[PDB]
Amino acid sequence: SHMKIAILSRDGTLYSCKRLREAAIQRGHLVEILDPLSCYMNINPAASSIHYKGRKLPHFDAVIPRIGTAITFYGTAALRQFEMLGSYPLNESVAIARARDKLRSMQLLARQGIDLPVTGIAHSPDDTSDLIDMVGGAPLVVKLVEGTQGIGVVLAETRQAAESVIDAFRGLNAHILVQEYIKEAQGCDIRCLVVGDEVVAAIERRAKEGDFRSNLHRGGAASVASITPQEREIAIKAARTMALDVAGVDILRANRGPLVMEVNASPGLEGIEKTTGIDIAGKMIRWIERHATT
Amino acid sequence: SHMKIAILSRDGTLYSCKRLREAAIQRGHLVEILDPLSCYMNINPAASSIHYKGRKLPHFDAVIPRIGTAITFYGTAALRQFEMLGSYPLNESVAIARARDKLRSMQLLARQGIDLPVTGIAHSPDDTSDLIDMVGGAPLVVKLVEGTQGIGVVLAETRQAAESVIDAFRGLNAHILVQEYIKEAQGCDIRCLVVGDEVVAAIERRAKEGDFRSNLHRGGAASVASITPQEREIAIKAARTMALDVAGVDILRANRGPLVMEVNASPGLEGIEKTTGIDIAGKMIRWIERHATT
Amino acid sequence: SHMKIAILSRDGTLYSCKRLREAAIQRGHLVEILDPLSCYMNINPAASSIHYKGRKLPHFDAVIPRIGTAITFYGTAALRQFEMLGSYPLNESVAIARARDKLRSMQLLARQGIDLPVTGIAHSPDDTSDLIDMVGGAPLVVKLVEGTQGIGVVLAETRQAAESVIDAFRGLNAHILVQEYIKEAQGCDIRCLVVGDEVVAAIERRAKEGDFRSNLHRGGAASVASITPQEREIAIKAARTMALDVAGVDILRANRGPLVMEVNASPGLEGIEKTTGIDIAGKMIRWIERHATT
Amino acid sequence: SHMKIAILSRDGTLYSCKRLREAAIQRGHLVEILDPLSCYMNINPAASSIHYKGRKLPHFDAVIPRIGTAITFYGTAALRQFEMLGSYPLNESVAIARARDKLRSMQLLARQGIDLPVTGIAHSPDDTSDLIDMVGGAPLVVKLVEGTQGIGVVLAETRQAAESVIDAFRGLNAHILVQEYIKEAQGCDIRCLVVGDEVVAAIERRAKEGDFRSNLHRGGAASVASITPQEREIAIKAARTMALDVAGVDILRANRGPLVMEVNASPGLEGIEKTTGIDIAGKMIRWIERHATT
Numbered sequence A, B, C, D: 001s002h003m004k005i006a007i008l009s010r011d012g013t014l015y016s017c018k019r020l021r022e023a024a025i026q027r028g029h030l031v032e033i034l035d036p037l038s039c040y041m042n043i044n045p046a047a048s049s050i051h052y053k054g055r056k057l058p059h060f061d062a063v064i065p066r067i068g069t070a071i072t073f074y075g076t077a078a079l080r081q082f083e084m085l086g087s088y089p090l091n092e093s094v095a096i097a098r099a100r101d102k103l104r105s106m107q108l109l110a111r112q113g114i115d116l117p118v119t120g121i122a123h124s125p126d127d128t129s130d131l132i133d134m135v136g137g138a139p140l141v142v143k144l145v146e147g148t149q150g151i152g153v154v155l156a157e158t159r160q161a162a163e164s165v166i167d168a169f170r171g172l173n174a175h176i177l178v179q180e181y182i183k184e185a186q187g188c189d190i191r192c193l194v195v196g197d198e199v200v201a202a203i204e205r206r207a208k209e210g211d212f213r214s215n216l217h218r219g220g221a222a223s224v225a226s227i228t229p230q231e232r233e234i235a236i237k238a239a240r241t242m243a244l245d246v247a248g249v250d251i252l253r254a255n256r257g258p259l260v261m262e263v264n265a266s267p268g269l270e271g272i273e274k275t276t277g278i279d280i281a282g283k284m285i286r287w288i289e290r291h292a293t294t
């Protein structure tokens, strides 16, 4: 096979080492790790080489984007150029772009029939009481966002709390914001990692005693997971709907059933690899091998 | 006919008055002008009504988005909900979203065969000299952007100027940036306004004595325009490529021929309407009449 | 007398007209209104002229700073240069600078013996429950700030509300934040305007039905005020403590007595002038006349 | 002696270790290292304890502020509270605050007779040519700032370069900006470190081949320095003028003589300690011992 594979990222972290590793090992591929920010190119005379530190890049059979949440406009532009040059991407630019927008993505998942928690959208709602009654929740989660980021989640246990919180963020200097109801669960969500058409690995993320969260480390403790066939199907459908080749789907276990809470196009590998012992980076290179033309 | 038409904008300016005007006059349509930021809704149980100041909106046959460049994530979300409810939009969410990204849009136009000025893309280029030689320019225009905004253009007449400018912005706190070569022209660009499959109006925008620009009012003076059939074709193709129903295409007259410099999905009406006397707002309502189902 | 007076502000609003007016009328002074942002100067060879639109400014006997809350670093720099050139300022740079910092100012007022509401300071407090118990409040006001701005106030009626709010802002992307207890009062605060050593005018600002606020227009309705001699003394002491020549002091009427809530170095004139009929702009020019050397 | 010493900083870096080290070793002082952001307190009932992670801090004989450039408003507030509680600070709040403002500080140094390079100040100058002629430079350095930060320096070798650069930043989204002329020197500046009334250590910082800079590591290489008695006097006067107990003064060797380029209230220790072998952290604790009351 022997492919030249580029990896779009800003630095060297476990994920970056684990695939330089798995690509050099597996069918003896060459790997260059490029900062997207350091790429520069003529978007005009259509295609045209990509430049990096004064030299022309040599044509990659494939590109592995792993673009940061704060560099996603330029990142996807550079990604787009690689695509136009013939490189196969796991996760294509459009898909990556759209996925960063949690609003667009939640909308899309909902339209395609995927069970989410009931969720409200707002920015400067003008009648908070009506917004709270919509969504139904008396206890619910409010998630501040600002553009396409996320700068906070918070639980509002009472009506008044939910009121004061929304009224706080309403001062648009916090910008777009999301309401959805809290769970049974217990600060425990399941993170499935999809590569192509299968769930490749899956862990339970568990909260700490102080309120909830559950985030990777907002106090989070990982443990290996027992996914139901139903959860497995869902997490694969979610990625398919988002047109993501690699994705992290987070699932909450509600009484009514499993609910998708979020979908990531650049899931971290370390926690989930170390927890399960699964060679995820390898399943990714393997996927490239099945799909990239050389 | 009698349609209910919503207009998505944050305030009442000429454009907003001129179509409340033209819609109430023309086939007696009703019009509500809504702040997108004041809309709130359940993106979950797919579709679901849109709320505004404590009440449910009553279903619009059509929506005219005119979303601001700084509110485009939430704006398009609200737009998307109207679309999911059955409202026809002139300019659809996806198209609007993509168009805000000048990088993606320049790329797309270039791929589809549309003559642009030669243009470079960069963020933190690491070898400015190579970047300047690429693009070729010895005098060229550098356009700072930051996300999806634009916070400056500047002419660099010499190599050294172009160097110091790029090196200035390279400190990423300016983020993404665009290089392209300057013109003959003379601070004069042509702005065509496309509605559907025709150019509906067109003006010459003329710079002032102090350097160049030409911007609406960076010193700009408008006058009525004599578009060549070729320019006309191009400006229509550009909008088609971008999948925009209404668009402002800006064209520079180079020796080699007309070049598209920019495409806007929310062109201002005042300057161009007053300059030409053309009823543009009416051609927009008319377009809705030909395409919205009631 | 005949002074040349400069006014540092970014535009022409009532305040700006009302003193061009009162200075040309009163002892026939000349007035130039300058954008601080348009001033440029050598901070080196100590003193040195200030340049404005290509020319050297002609030496002002006095400067009236009215610098915006978002331009206060450069504004005060330009102010400082005028001071170094010999111009008398009503409100000096240091005083203006310090006053913009509500934290430093609240601290200072408290140290000097001036009754404030009980007030807590926090940024990323780590134990919200302890923070709420400190301050004592079960209902209290949380005021988000971010640098030196203010981007929100909110009432938290219960413990849980106060919790969810603080936890929301704790995500430092909101930065510094202030807790203090709510009042009897009733959305009514008294705004006194101090010029030199007297309160020159004073209005009642009254909230609307929807929650509280009281802000100028967050729904605010003004009416003429009956200040107690005690309130009068306090508002004069506050300005003295802050070393402000002109200041807006806001006072809340608590059971225990009058409490200073805020001190502004650039109070607006329109609402308070129109409400009372007092010639405030004139008392300001008069103050300059008593203190500037010609 | 035996003092309790608090160190205000956000994390554990060499500087933070080297004084936990030197304070526990030297006259057996106790040391707590506190995040300023985690402090919370009643700025009202004047003084009042400082809270940290749910508990009351136990009263420090001294505080060593080492506050970050992006947290300086809240940092100095917390600092101020310690001061009000009786703790001696090396570097007091006012001094630290003022020092962060490079504009105010450059002004002050200039007024007090300290030779700087000739320096211009601007934000949106309206006539760049006049600004460049002022300052005199044909080659000069332009330093972008934005509030109180610094987000770039750049050399402009020609008039045109200097023009395009200033015109670029003029789009206020870059905000305040500084012009001063370039040097002989050669990317080499001298950094002196003042503790109290002496220069305690001093290094040469040397640029790399690619343009200039010289910054700690913008390519910087350190080497031990031979300060003239004159340079020594100056660096001590600068700190005295700024009322800083500990400061980093940077000096450029011009033909006309040594020029102060910058003064820092929180100089890094690592580069300069390792380069010279001097126990700087110890001279700081020693200074506290000579000045703090127990």
Ligand SMILES: Nc1ncnc2c1ncn2[C@@H]1O[C@H](COP(=O)(O)OP(=O)(O)O)[C@@H](O)[C@H]1O
Pocket: A117, A141, A143, A153, A180, A181, A182, A183, A185, A187, A188, A189, A212, A213, A214, A215, A216, A250, A252, A261, A262
């Ligand atoms: N609607 C909800 N109900 C219950 N728990 C939630 C809800 N939303 C978020 N959480 C918890 O808070 C944590 C933070 O969620 P979020 O930041 O939205 O996703 P992620 O964990 O992917 O960053 C999650 O891991 C989850 O356990």
Ligand SMILES: Nc1ncnc2c1ncn2[C@@H]1O[C@H](COP(=O)(O)OP(=O)(O)O)[C@@H](O)[C@H]1O
Pocket: B117, B141, B143, B153, B180, B181, B182, B183, B185, B187, B188, B189, B212, B213, B214, B215, B216, B250, B252, B261, B262
């Ligand atoms: N590559 C170029 N060559 C010559 N002139 C240009 C170039 N780019 C921009 N200009 C001039 O500068 C003005 C500012 O352009 P820009 O801000 O990119 O577009 P818009 O005018 O749509 O805001 C334009 O009207 C144009 O006349």
Ligand SMILES: Nc1ncnc2c1ncn2[C@@H]1O[C@H](COP(=O)(O)OP(=O)(O)O)[C@@H](O)[C@H]1O
Pocket: C117, C141, C143, C153, C180, C181, C182, C183, C185, C187, C188, C189, C212, C213, C214, C215, C216, C250, C252, C261, C262
């Ligand atoms: N601690 C408090 N108790 C009661 N009412 C308050 C309190 N703080 C603020 N308010 C009300 O909210 C309004 C907003 O206050 P703020 O924005 O801090 O001051 P300003 O009115 O000077 O902008 C005030 O006019 C006041 O009436």
Ligand SMILES: Nc1ncnc2c1ncn2[C@@H]1O[C@H](COP(=O)(O)OP(=O)(O)O)[C@@H](O)[C@H]1O
Pocket: D117, D141, D143, D153, D180, D181, D182, D183, D185, D187, D188, D189, D212, D213, D214, D215, D216, D250, D252, D261, D262
């Ligand atoms: N006016 C000047 N002339 C020559 N060299 C300069 C000038 N200003 C800055 N430099 C060089 O550029 C580097 C960056 O300077 P700056 O960022 O202002 O200070 P610091 O090095 O303290 O961060 C300096 O170390 C200095 O060597």
Ligand SMILES: N[C@@H](CCC(=O)O)C(=O)O
Pocket: A098, A104, A105, A106, A107, A108, A109, A111, B080, B084, B094
């Ligand atoms: N959220 C949209 C999809 C957005 C998109 O296709 O880009 C939907 O309901 O289908």
Ligand SMILES: N[C@@H](CCC(=O)O)C(=O)O
Pocket: A080, A084, A094, B098, B104, B105, B106, B107, B108, B109, B111
């Ligand atoms: N710029 C891309 C198109 C982007 C898109 O389709 O969203 C191209 O070359 O086709």
Ligand SMILES: N[C@@H](CCC(=O)O)C(=O)O
Pocket: C098, C104, C105, C106, C107, C108, C109, C111, D080, D084, D094
């Ligand atoms: N807040 C400080 C005063 C701040 C200052 O003097 O700048 C005090 O308690 O005195």
Ligand SMILES: N[C@@H](CCC(=O)O)C(=O)O
Pocket: C080, C084, C094, D098, D104, D105, D106, D107, D108, D109, D111
């Ligand atoms: N730069 C001012 C000093 C500023 C201050 O004292 O705070 C001067 O020329 O003295």
